Every structure is written in C-alpha cells, then in structure tokens.
Ligand binder design. Structure first.
Ligand SMILES: CC(C)CCC[C@@H](C)[C@H]1CC[C@H]2[C@@H]3CC=C4C[C@@H](OC(=O)CCC(=O)O)CC[C@]4(C)[C@H]3CC[C@]12C
Ligand SMILES: CC(C)CCC[C@@H](C)[C@H]1CC[C@H]2[C@@H]3CC=C4C[C@@H](OC(=O)CCC(=O)O)CC[C@]4(C)[C@H]3CC[C@]12C
Ligand SMILES: CC(C)CCC[C@@H](C)[C@H]1CC[C@H]2[C@@H]3CC=C4C[C@@H](OC(=O)CCC(=O)O)CC[C@]4(C)[C@H]3CC[C@]12C
Ligand SMILES: CC(C)CCC[C@@H](C)[C@H]1CC[C@H]2[C@@H]3CC=C4C[C@@H](OC(=O)CCC(=O)O)CC[C@]4(C)[C@H]3CC[C@]12C
Ligand SMILES: FC(F)(F)c1ccccc1-c1cc(C(F)(F)F)c2[nH]c(C3=NOC4(CCCCC4)C3)nc2c1
Ligand SMILES: FC(F)(F)c1ccccc1-c1cc(C(F)(F)F)c2[nH]c(C3=NOC4(CCCCC4)C3)nc2c1
Lengths: 99, 99
C-alpha cells in the first residue's frame, strides 16, 4: 500500500492478471503465498469486492490527499511569510557570531 | 479509463503495440475480445482517430483536472480557515462531555 501511492498498481487483485509463477503454495520459498483456491483449483476471491476497494484507495491516496497537502502548504507559506524573515534575521546573529 | 488517470496508458490503440496474445477471437475465454479484422487479417481501426482522442483524454484527466482540484482546495482552505476553528471549539464541548 505504501508503494501504491507512487503509481504502482497491485497485481494480485484480478483473476486474469494474477500469475501463479510469482506465488508459492507452501512457505518453503521467498515469495508471497498463493491465493486461496477452490475444489476446481481457481481463485476464490469474489473479484467484485477487491477492485472497487483498490479504486477508492488509489483515488484517496494518489489524488485527493496530495492535493490537500499542496493546499495546506500554500496557505502556510502565505500566512507565515513575514515572521520567517524575522526568525532568519534573529538566527543570523548566531550564524555570524559563530566565526 | 479510470486507471488511465493513474499513469496507465491504453495498449490496444496502436497497431504496432497491439498484441494478439492477450485477446481472444471468440468469447470462450476470460480475456477481452480481439480487435475487428479485415479480409487481409489486419487491424481495421484507422489509428489516426484513436491516438488524438487518447492524447486529449489524458491531457484533460492527468494534468488539467487535478491542477484545478488543487486550486479549488487551496481557495477553500484559505476561505474557511477561521470558521473551522469555531466549529472545532464547539464540537470540543461534546468531545469533552463524552467522558
Ligand atoms: C466515481 C467512479 C468514477 C469510481 C468507481 C467507478 C468504477 C471504477 C468501479 C465502480 C464499480 C466497479 C465494478 C463493480 C463490479 C464489477 C464486475 C467485476 O466482474 C465480476 O464481478 C465477476 C466476478 C467473478 O468472476 O467471480 C469486474 C469489475 C466491475 C465492472 C467493477 C469495476 C470498476 C467499477 C465499474
Ligand atoms: C462492497 C465493497 C466493494 C465496497 C464497500 C467497502 C468499503 C469501500 C466501504 C466499507 C465501509 C465504508 C466507510 C464507512 C465510513 C466512512 C467515513 C466517511 O467519512 C467520514 O469519516 C466523515 C463523516 C462526516 O463527515 O460526518 C467516508 C466514507 C467511509 C470511508 C465509508 C466509505 C466506504 C467504506 C470504506
Ligand atoms: C497540443 C499538442 C501538443 C497535442 C496533440 C499533438 C500530438 C500528440 C497529436 C496531434 C495530431 C496527432 C497525429 C494525427 C495523425 C497521425 C498519423 C498516424 O499514423 C496513421 O495515420 C497511419 C494510419 C494507418 O496505418 O492505417 C500516427 C500518429 C499521428 C502522427 C498522430 C499522433 C499524435 C499527433 C501528432
Ligand atoms: C478526429 C478525432 C481524432 C478528433 C476529434 C474528436 C474529438 C476530439 C472532438 C469531437 C467533438 C469535440 C468536442 C465538441 C464540444 C466540446 C466542448 C468544449 O467546451 C465546452 O463545452 C464549453 C464551451 C464554451 O465555453 O462556450 C471543448 C471542446 C469539446 C470537448 C470539443 C473538442 C473535441 C471533440 C471532443
Ligand atoms: F484528502 C482526503 F482525506 F482524502 C479527502 C479530501 C477531501 C475530501 C474528502 C477526503 C477523504 C476523507 C476521508 C475520511 F475523512 F473519512 F477519512 C476519507 N476516507 C477514505 C477512505 N476510507 O477508507 C479508504 C481507505 C481504506 C480502504 C477503504 C477506502 C479510503 N477516503 C477519504 C477521503
Ligand atoms: F479541468 C478541465 F476541465 F479539464 C479544464 C480546465 C481548464 C480549462 C478547460 C478545462 C476543460 C473543460 C472541458 C469542458 F468544460 F468542456 F467539459 C473539457 N472537455 C474536455 C474533453 N472533452 O471530451 C474529452 C473526454 C472524452 C473524449 C473526448 C475528449 C476531453 N476536456 C476539457 C477540459
């Protein structure tokens, strides 16, 4: 999910896209466990629950949240522009007196 | 089209890029139907109609719309900053009295 915000889309969520080469049935390996199967040896997850969930998650993370953060940063830089100059001037005394 | 905003570019829009392995001629399969062919067994779509359409769609979605949303969020956070404090203070009474 952390990578999902950087444009990476989960792969093991669609039966068609899912590939069994990556996964392993047992734990004696270094790749993720395979999806739970059925008596017919096919993926069992409904596939109409995961896709909308991922769509909503990606919409919330990639787009809305970053835009909100941009807005907050804009307001913050606008609000405290003048006080930052005074703070920098105050610290300039220490910076100059250091040498 | 929903995924198209997350940076994914459609593949079955260019004759060179289009691959027949994914598609299926008949419906007895779990992958999308193949593009309509011609008497010579080649893709039939003009290829000069789809590409500009996709370019315009991607330009509208990925870039313009999200930037507009960012602008709206910035204006909204700027406008209602003071009233939000009063609303939070009002709800603080209920939050404190809950316990
Ligand atoms: C505000 C909008 C733009 C955001 C959400 C729109 C779509 C991205 C979502 C909403 C409901 C979703 C659909 C809900 C159910 C299904 C059927 C699903 O196929 C199955 O259910 C078969 C299940 C099986 O084979 O076991 C494939 C995706 C689809 C069309 C989902 C794909 C994406 C849809 C259209
Ligand atoms: C069947 C599947 C594919 C779709 C449904 C699964 C989730 C997408 C549902 C389950 C619980 C739902 C959530 C229940 C509570 C909330 C909080 C709500 O926002 C708030 O917390 C503020 C409410 C307010 O302003 O008063 C927005 C929707 C959300 C995430 C709901 C949206 C959709 C959720 C996550
Ligand atoms: C404001 C600008 C920056 C946005 C649009 C610019 C280009 C991305 C678009 C505008 C018109 C498009 C062109 C319209 C027609 C064609 C020819 C097309 O090839 C064919 O028509 C052959 C058809 C066939 O083989 O059957 C390949 C793409 C190209 C150059 C299109 C590719 C992209 C172009 C240059
Ligand atoms: C031959 C192919 C490859 C290019 C042409 C196909 C589409 C790109 C054309 C067909 C109809 C056109 C649309 C007709 C109407 C509108 C609405 C217009 O914006 C408005 O609705 C507001 C108008 C106003 O401000 O008065 C912007 C262009 C658009 C999307 C036009 C732009 C280009 C469209 C989508
Ligand atoms: F910037 C932002 F915050 F996105 C946002 C900006 C502008 C307007 C609304 C929101 C918002 C707020 C909340 C809430 F206030 F409720 F937290 C949201 N919650 C969710 C989801 N909940 O669960 C999901 C993740 C876990 C899987 C199920 C889906 C996404 N999307 C929200 C969007
Ligand atoms: F933020 C935004 F809105 F993008 C936008 C922001 C700033 C200036 C203009 C726009 C805008 C407005 C409209 C309209 F107001 F007309 F709706 C647009 N329409 C379209 C397209 N129409 O159809 C397409 C999708 C379907 C396939 C054909 C191409 C894209 N791009 C627009 C850009």
């Amino acid at each position: 999910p952390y990578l999902a915000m950087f444009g990476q889309y989960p792969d093991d969520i669609d039966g068609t896209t899912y590939n069994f080469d990556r996964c392993t049935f047992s734990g004696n390996e270094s790749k993720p466990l395979c999806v739970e199967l059925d008596a017919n040896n096919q993926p069992r997850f409904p596939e109409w629950i995961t896709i909308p969930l991922v769509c909503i998650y990606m919409l919330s993370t990639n787009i809305l949240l970053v835009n909100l953060l941009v807005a907050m940063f804009g307001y913050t830089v606008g609000s405290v522009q003048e006080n930052n100059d005074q703070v920098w001037k105050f610290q300039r005394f220490f910076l100059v007196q250091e040498y």
